[PDB]
């Protein structure tokens, strides 16, 4: 396994293979972090999170 097939490319959410490298992206309501891998919720009640 390589790229996205290897632990989701280390991405938090979506992983695509562009050229021969991993590109991570995020659902609406999240932004991609500086490290280009983590997804940071932009508000309260982002999609997909159980509520606390």
């Amino acid at each position: 396994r390589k790229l996205c097939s290897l632990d989701n490319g280390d991405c938090d959410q979506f992983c695509h293979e562009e050229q021969n490298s991993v590109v991570c992206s995020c659902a609406r309501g999240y932004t991609l972090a500086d490290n280009g891998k983590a997804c940071i919720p932009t508000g309260p009640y982002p999609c997909g999170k159980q509520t606390l």
């Binding site: 659902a27 009640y45 999609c47 997909g48 509520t51």
Partner: protein, 233 residues
Amino acid sequence: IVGGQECKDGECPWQALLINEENEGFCGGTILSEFYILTAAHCLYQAKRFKVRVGDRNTEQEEGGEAVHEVEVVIKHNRFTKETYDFDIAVLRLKTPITFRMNVAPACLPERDWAESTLMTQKTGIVSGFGRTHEKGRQSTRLKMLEVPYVDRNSCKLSSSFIITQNMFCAGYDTKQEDACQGDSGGPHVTRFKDTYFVTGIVSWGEGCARKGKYGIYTKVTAFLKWIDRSMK
């Protein structure tokens, strides 16, 4: 839901409930955003007029977090077929926006290719609803959830007395007495990925509930992502 567990506080916040004029639930839905609910097309033929309740876990008692929303626009898939329940999907636009809060939050829409190779290849997804607790019984007054295994397409073709189109997928157990049931229809099938929940299915149909060698049949959300996106404008 037959078997399964109660949704505890805050566990199933994307659940919606369609309620008829008599204020009784008849189908589920999934919150996609402040204005849009995802449900099953077949649910639209079961009430002349209906509204959407969000934030409810116990229909026996208003616990203050519940809200009702009227439906402005119904968008039913044009290719839905009563015969086979193919294209069993609809989107509802609400007249007024949902306020997100404890027990009210949207599920994420995934991207199609990643969803198919990454989410639908996981072991299990989670289905939820206020439907029947047994094939012949009454509807749950509490919101229940159930973890259901994804089922091989071939196994599911063989198990089924009705055609399984490519717009459907199967989930559930061979013999174990756990399954969605009547009244769960329209509701969420979600797949967890790293503590984030993405919508992957719509509760569509089954031959009875929890029968041996039978599975639950869900609308395959990934086949409709563009349609949904268009419908939400």
